[PDB]
Amino acid sequence: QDVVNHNAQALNTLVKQLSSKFGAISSVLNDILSRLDPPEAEVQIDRLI
Amino acid sequence: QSYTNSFTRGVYYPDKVFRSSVLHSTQDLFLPFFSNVTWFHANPVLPFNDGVYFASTEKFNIIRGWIFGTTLDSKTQSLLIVNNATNAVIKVCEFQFKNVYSSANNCTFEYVSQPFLKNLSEFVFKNIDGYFKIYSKHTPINLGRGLPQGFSALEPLVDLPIGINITRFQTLLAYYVGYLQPRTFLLKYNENGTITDAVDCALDPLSETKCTLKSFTVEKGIYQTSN
Amino acid sequence: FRVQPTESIVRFPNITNLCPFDEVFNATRFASVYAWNRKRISNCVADYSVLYNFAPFFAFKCYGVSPTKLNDLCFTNVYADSFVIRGNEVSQIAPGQTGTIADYNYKLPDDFTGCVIAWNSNKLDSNGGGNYNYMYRLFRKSKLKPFERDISTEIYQAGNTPCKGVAGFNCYFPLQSYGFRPTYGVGHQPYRVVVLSFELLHAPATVCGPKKSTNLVKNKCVNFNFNGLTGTGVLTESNKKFLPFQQFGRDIADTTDAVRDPQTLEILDITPCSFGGVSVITPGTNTSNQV
Amino acid sequence: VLYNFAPFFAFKCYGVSPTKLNDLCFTNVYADSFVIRGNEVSQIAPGQ
Numbered sequence: 027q028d029v030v031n032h033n034a035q036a037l038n039t040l041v042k043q044l045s046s047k048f049g050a051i052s053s054v055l056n057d058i059l060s061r062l063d064p065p066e067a068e069v070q071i072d073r074l075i
Numbered sequence: 076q077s078y079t080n081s082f083t084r085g086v087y088y089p090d091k092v093f094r095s096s097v098l099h100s101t102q103d104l105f106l107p108f109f110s111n112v113t114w115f116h117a118n119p120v121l122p123f124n125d126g127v128y129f130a131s132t133e134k135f136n137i138i139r140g141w142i143f144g145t146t147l148d149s150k151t152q153s154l155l156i157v158n159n160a161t162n163a164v165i166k167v168c169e170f171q172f173k174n175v176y177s178s179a180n181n182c183t184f185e186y187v188s189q190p191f192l193k194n195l196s197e198f199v200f201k202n203i204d205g206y207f208k209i210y211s212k213h214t215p216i217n218l219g220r221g222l223p224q225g226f227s228a229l230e231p232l233v234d235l236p237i238g239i240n241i242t243r244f245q246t247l248l249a250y251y252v253g254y255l256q257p258r259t260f261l262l263k264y265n266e267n268g269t270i271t272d273a274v275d276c277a278l279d280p281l282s283e284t285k286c287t288l289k290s291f292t293v294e295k296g297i298y299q300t301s302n
Numbered sequence: 303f304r305v306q307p308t309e310s311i312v313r314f315p316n317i318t319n320l321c322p323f324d325e326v327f328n329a330t331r332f333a334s335v336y337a338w339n340r341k342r343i344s345n346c347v348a349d350y351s352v353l354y355n356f357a358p359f360f361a362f363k364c365y366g367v368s369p370t371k372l373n374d375l376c377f378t379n380v381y382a383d384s385f386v387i388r389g390n391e392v393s394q395i396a397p398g399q400t401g402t403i404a405d406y407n408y409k410l411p412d413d414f415t416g417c418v419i420a421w422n423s424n425k426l427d428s429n430g431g432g433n434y435n436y437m438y439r440l441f442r443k444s445k446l447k448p449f450e451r452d453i454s455t456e457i458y459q460a461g462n463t464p465c466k467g468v469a470g471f472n473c474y475f476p477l478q479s480y481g482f483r484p485t486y487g488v489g490h491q492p493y494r495v496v497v498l499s500f501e502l503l504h505a506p507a508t509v510c511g512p513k514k515s516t517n518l519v520k521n522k523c524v525n526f527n528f529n530g531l532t533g534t535g536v537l538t539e540s541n542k543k544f545l546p547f548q549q550f551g552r553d554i555a556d557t558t559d560a561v562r563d564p565q566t567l568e569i570l571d572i573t574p575c576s577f578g579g580v581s582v583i584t585p586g587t588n589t590s591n592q593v
Numbered sequence: 594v595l596y597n598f599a600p601f602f603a604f605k606c607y608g609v610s611p612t613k614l615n616d617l618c619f620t621n622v623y624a625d626s627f628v629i630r631g632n633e634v635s636q637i638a639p640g641q
């Protein structure tokens with residue numbers, strides 16, 4: 027049970043990390059693409075990356 | 076002007092998002108569990124603070140409106156909600172009350188909707204970033220001290236995009252008044268998306284443990300909570 | 303590999319009211335800097351193209367958004383702040399700026415998102431009245447907080463001696479009027495300035511651009527744009543019981559998995575299009591080239 | 594007292610905030626004074 031719980035918890039944390047901003051304006055890449063031109067989108071995309 | 080225990084009353088859906096069978100942690104302005112709420116059997120002007128929880132139980136519809144604002148005169152804008160047997164109207168005019176209003180001038184925003192109002196009616200008023208948010212709920216209760224021990228969430232009644240300044244409020248004619256503090260709550264969404272239970276993470280060590288474990292049930296042991 | 307989307311669908315509500323940018327921009331008299339006029343914009347179709355028919359503006363500077371992308375975005379609400387300033391001071395209308403106008407008359411937030419548009423007004427504000435009497439606050443005890451208006455005419459007490467409400471030595475009048483004249487050079491010409499501040503996410507979107515609403519396609523991998531919510535996936539009938547105030551649903555991982563159609567008011571479940579790894583099974587190339 | 598000497602149009606501080614000056618201790622200060630043209634004032638900055 028501990029092995030199963032550890033695997034599930036690690037996967038859940040990995041998925042939850044996609045909701046973080048990491049200093050960007052948004053955590054959704056499509057919003058960055060649809061709101062900003064490339065020269066300004068690069069900074070936010072790199073911060074997410 | 077007595078005091079009463081708030082029990083678990085004063086929980087509202089913090090956002091429009093739908094969730095089913097989840098335990099979700101939200102940091103927002105809430106009414107703390109088992110808090111002291113003022114009880115009036117009559118209506119002086121009260122401070123607004125961060126937000127207001129309001130509860131009424133009259134069957135004669137004596138309570139028919141609220142007034143919000145800083146000066147409550149024509150000097151500054153004063154929000155005014157008046158409910159009558161057909162509808163509920165909302166204005167932000169500058170008024171000069173005397174006791175409806177002796178004079179009204181410089182109206183900016185108006186709104187008309189279904190009337191807001193034993194049958195216990197609960198309301199939550201917040202004023203944040205130029206938005207006045209009203210949450211409401213109506214529940215069947217029985218006779219007693221007041222504010223029963225059950226749990227019921229307050230659905231978003233209305234939102235007003237009015238950027239006004241509010242520091243005090245007053246009611247217009249047995250009602251209960253409480254204040255909201257910034258708290259972290261753990262809400263439970265059942266299979267149908269209805270908030271059925273909540274945990275106030277600052278109530279006691281057990282609730283803090285429940286919030287840390289993100290669960291409503293805690294197994295036997297020792298758990299390292301906040302420092 | 304990944305299943306590629308077939309179609310793209312946009313679902314916007316029946317709102318057809320044009321946003322009142324005409325009255326905001328085509329106003330006979332703009333307010334002064336210290337009393338910048340703020341108007342709320344909501345529940346309308348924001349066609350920014352008409353803004354190009356009102357002025358050949360020399361500044362269209364947008365923060366947090368691109369000017370060409372405006373017609374394809376949905377906003378929850380917009381603040382339109384209008385005033386008249388001097389040309390050389392236009393650069394002070396920006397986040398993280400220090401100056402008399404920036405700190406004492408109109409201040410923008412650090413996280414400000416929106417646009418600023420300034421255009422020429424010599425031919426319309428070089429006359430008498432308030433046009434020549436455009437005023438602005440020159441002195442203040444502390445810098446203005448973002449989105450704050452102070453129209454008080456208090457005498458600024460520079461010295462220790464109290465002023466008692468009377469202007470005198472070290473007792474100045476902060477509200478100083480402009481001297482806009484047609485004879486002045488480009489360093490002193492008057493410009494009309496309008497600042498649009500957008501609010502995204504959170505509340506349901508009610509200010510959207512001029513984007514047509516297409517048909518609804520189900521059980522196909524498609525791109526969907528639901529009131530600015532952009533995504534790719536498969537839309538199906540859902541058994542989720544959305545409450546009347548609820549718009550979209552999220553899972554445990556907080557990924558949008560349900561959405562309410564703005565027009566038909568039905569609940570659609572969203573499933574990501576199929577993907578996965580591809581593996582090549584092969585005997586050694588010494589044996590055969592079949593895979 | 595610097596606010597009693599001039600209504601300066603530029604008070605630009607690098608590495609410190611102007612409002613925080615009254616609450617800081619410095620080991621020593623260099624005061625460099627001159628007269629320049631207005632449009633050239635922007636040239637008085639690091640990396641110019």
Ligand SMILES: *[C@@H]1O[C@H](CO)[C@@H](O)[C@H](O)[C@H]1NC(C)=O
Pocket residue numbers: 078109110111
């Ligand atoms: C409520 O008030 C009473 C008396 O004013 C006090 O004894 C009690 O501790 C208060 N309750 C809370 C939760 O503070």
Ligand SMILES: *[C@@H]1O[C@H](CO)[C@@H](O)[C@H](O)[C@H]1NC(C)=O
Pocket residue numbers: 145146240241242
């Ligand atoms: C609201 O009014 C109070 C007093 O009436 C005042 O102290 C406060 O600064 C005001 N806030 C705004 C945003 O106007």
Ligand SMILES: *[C@@H]1O[C@H](CO)[C@@H](O)[C@H](O)[C@H]1NC(C)=O
Pocket residue numbers: 159160161162164
């Ligand atoms: C309730 O107030 C509204 C607001 O003016 C009014 O239109 C309506 O007629 C009123 N209802 C009754 C029954 O008077």
Ligand SMILES: *[C@@H]1O[C@H](CO)[C@@H](O)[C@H](O)[C@H]1NC(C)=O
Pocket residue numbers: 149180181
């Ligand atoms: C109503 O608003 C106008 C416009 O700002 C103002 O001139 C007038 O003085 C206001 N009314 C009162 C009684 O102050």
Ligand SMILES: *[C@@H]1O[C@H](CO)[C@@H](O)[C@H](O)[C@H]1NC(C)=O
Pocket residue numbers: 192194213214215
């Ligand atoms: C209490 O009032 C609400 C709204 O006025 C109503 O929906 C509900 O049925 C009432 N409860 C009872 C027991 O009548």
Ligand SMILES: *[C@@H]1O[C@H](CO)[C@@H](O)[C@H](O)[C@H]1NC(C)=O
Pocket residue numbers: 265266267543
């Ligand atoms: C959820 O709703 C369905 C039908 O709407 C009902 O059958 C079921 O009992 C509900 N579940 C709960 C826990 O209320």
Ligand SMILES: *[C@@H]1O[C@H](CO)[C@@H](O)[C@H](O)[C@H]1NC(C)=O
Pocket residue numbers: 328355356357
């Ligand atoms: C403003 O409106 C008037 C009449 O409505 C029109 O004559 C004028 O050309 C308009 N100007 C602009 C810049 O739209």
Ligand SMILES: *[C@@H]1O[C@H](CO)[C@@H](O)[C@H](O)[C@H]1NC(C)=O
Pocket residue numbers: 315316564565566
């Ligand atoms: C939008 O208009 C269509 C056209 O008939 C109608 O079928 C639909 O119900 C309308 N929806 C809303 C939300 O107004």
Ligand SMILES: *[C@@H]1O[C@H](CO)[C@@H](O)[C@H](O)[C@H]1NC(C)=O
Pocket residue numbers: 597598599
């Ligand atoms: C400079 O000093 C002289 C005399 O000491 C005084 O008259 C003058 O006002 C001062 N000017 C400033 C700007 O301090």
